Symmetry: C3
Subunit: 164 residues, 3 copies
């Protein structure tokens, strides 16, 4: 009953990531599923090698959730008479890459300190906001540690975007 | 003041939960307020039997936040033996029922490990994403533990959806 | 290219907060960046006096993320009586002020208990939902403690809204 359904849209879901070697200050981009299950891309919105390609200039709502999981470090142990230690952390950043502009722009960042006292831990980081994007722009999701990303379920780790 | 405004929309808010009988091993569904305070259903969106009934096929953005609260368990107090205990957890899942399976499809899931050290705790889990739905499809929010859900305020626990 | 690109929209980003003498019986409102970097206001959306002024009645999706951070307190140090301490907490509330009703209406609230063991901690609280708003209504983001708000990056703390 409408014609605004021709707007670029995409919902991508996590897939097994390929273990890569990187420096602490490096944030690997995630690989996504774009056609199977709940994943999809329509109306010219295309997915290609970690990037979501913007086909039309306009304001887009961009979102992503990344569930992290891992064994509890020793952040919580037996310190001194009141001298704890720095906590670990996890981070998700949604980045925008423009061909005319080399240096990527960080649009969203979700960062959390981690220092649990249990056997193991897990938690999601959700991010969502509206940005003005240009045709040709490319979006990618970077995380602090690929090995901590839960890639098991399409409903726990995803990334999507739509033209408003 | 817009032509494209007759779109199905709804924002549901939490209420004290009426106990429902425990029949099977599954996440119990939350039931909501849909017409009082900040809650509403309009343009054919139908809130029925704990489900948000989709009146028109298309792409919808659905979202929910559930705030959990409780007394701290004994997870923190690990048996003196250099061995931490398995952490507790809280989960929120948004499910789709299409009657075309009719096995429910989990659209979004937010799950966090919980091993607090204070006397008590509380935290929210927020989820939101876009999905292609058909008329007749049904959406519900399920949780890991009804007794841990904060039902005190309409602004702390809610669920909503709108046609893009 | 479109026809609905004339809808009120805005994405606000954090800035160093100016010390204020707020009333102890209320959460201080944050002030934002509205035109530099990733921030913007358009199609009549008006950011004035810490408020996002609604220029057109309709249904709006509003969101915000506030990243909090601080040096851990004594909560982690359970009482010498083998009893846990009441936790500290961080809260974000998105409030609506109307010309009609005298008191403000809380639309969204994200509240989290804080009782870390590490030396320091940091975490984001993200909120997003849809509300029916009338021209003239004003939206603001209030927080429990301004000194715990990370004002460092435009991608960590933000606030936005767009007409549906
Ligand atoms: Mg009722």
């Amino acid at each position: 009953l409408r014609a605004d359904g021709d707007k670029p849209r995409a919902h991508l879901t996590v897939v097994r990531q390929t273990p890569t070697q990187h420096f602490k200050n490096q944030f690997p981009a995630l690989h996504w599923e774009h056609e199977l299950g709940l994943a999809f891309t329509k109306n010219r919105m295309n997915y290609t090698n970690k990037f979501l390609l913007i086909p039309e200039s306009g304001d887009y709502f961009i979102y992503s959730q990344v569930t992290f999981r891992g064994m509890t470090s020793e952040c919580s142990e037996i310190r001194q008479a009141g001298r704890p230690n720095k906590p670990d952390s996890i981070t998700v950043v949604i980045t925008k890459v423009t061909d005319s502009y080399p240096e990527p722009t960080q649009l969203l960042m979700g960062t959390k300190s981690v220092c649990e006292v249990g056997s193991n831990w897990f938690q999601p980081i959700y991010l969502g906001a509206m940005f003005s994007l240009q045709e040709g722009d490319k979006l990618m999701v970077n995380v602090s540690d690929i090995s901590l990303v839960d890639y098991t379920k399409e409903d726990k780790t995803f990334f999507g975007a739509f033209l408003l």
